[PDB]
From a paper:
The mGeos series of rsFP’s display similar switching behavior to Dronpa. The series was developed from mEos2, with mutations that remove the undesirable irreversible green-to-red photo conversation, increase fluorescence brightness and provide high thermal stability of the off-state. [name] represents a further improvement, with reduced per cycle bleaching and higher photoswitching quantum yield in the on→off than Dronpa. We present high resolution room temperature SFX structures of [name] in both ‘on’ and meta-stable ‘off’ state collected using two different XFELs, the SPring-8 Angstrom Compact free electron Laser (SACLA), Japan and the Linear Coherent Light Source (LCLS), USA.
We collected datasets for the dark on-state using two different methods at the SACLA/EH4 station using the DAPHNIS chamber. Firstly, by using the grease injection method, we selected relatively large crystals of 50–100 μm in size. Diffraction was collected up to 1.9 Å resolution with diffraction still present in the corners of the detector. The hit-rate could be carefully controlled with the crystal density, and levels of 40% could be sustained with crystal densities of 4.8 × 107–9 × 107 crystal/mL. Table 1 shows the CC* and R-split values that reveal data from the droplet method was lower quality than that obtained from the grease injection method. The comparison between the two on-state structures collected with the grease injection and droplet methods under the same conditions (Black) showed the lowest R-factor over the intermediate resolution range up to ≈3 Å resolution. An increase of the R-factor for the increased resolution (<3 Å) is likely indicative of genuine structural differences between the grease and droplet methods, in agreement with the observed degradation of R-split and CC* when merging intensities together (Black). The dehydrating effect on the crystals due to the mother liquor being replaced with a mineral oil–based grease matrix in the grease injection method could explain this difference. Following complete refinement of all four datasets, both on-state structures showed no statistically significant density in either the 2Fobs-Fcalc or the Fobs-Fcalc maps that could be assigned to a trans chromophore structure. The same was observed for chromophore omit maps, that also, at lower sigma levels, did not show such density. This is in agreement with the dark incubation and dark sample injection which corresponds to a 100% on-state concentration. Photoisomerisation is clearly seen in a comparison of the “on” and “off” refined structures where the dihedral angle of the chain connecting the phenol ring to the rest of the chromophore (N–C=C–C) changes from 1° (cis) → 171.1° (trans) in the on- vs the off-state and the pheonolic oxygen is displaced by 6.2 Å.
Numbering used by the authors: 2 to 61, 65 to 219
The structure:
Amino acid sequence: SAIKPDMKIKLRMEGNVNGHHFVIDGDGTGKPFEGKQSMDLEVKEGGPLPFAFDILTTAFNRVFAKYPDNIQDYFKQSFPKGYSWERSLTFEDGGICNARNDITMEGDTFYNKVRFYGTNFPANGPVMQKKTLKWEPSTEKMYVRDGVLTGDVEMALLLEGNAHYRCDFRTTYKAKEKGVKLPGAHFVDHCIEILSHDKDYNKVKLYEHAVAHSG
């Protein structure tokens, strides 16, 4: 009821990876009930980025997921006040990232305040050498841990030379308003894709389709 079938999205990300500082703006639209969104991104400071753009893409909102009637939708029930999430990303060669997003809504627009910090990526590894191609489609497991809604996903970045580079996500999600009821455990399938880009990934168009289910 707060959430319309078509919503606009505004975003700013600030961050630092291996010491490199950057600022990225996003402008997008999506369909919350169909689980589809896309976004145009533009690096404003720090470009051309010296690391694989792909590590950032899942930090650029689980409101855009199709939920069936039989699973409580914690994210759509969080609005208009909104919610926040914090994520750790643990890569198999020791790279580590922490990201957060604080999401608010004004009228027909979501605003996103995103922070992304990464460290310990080996200078000779696929992230700093820009050898990544895409994330594989994934399944996030949603459950409650110590009273907090938690999503785990085992992610894989396809690399040049048909190898995958693995990363474990853990995200915690918290409604701003007390007493939004927690859902039962469930799954969210995701597919995220870079649809287009320019030479050094200073301008990128991103898309995600996500669908909640019970297994």
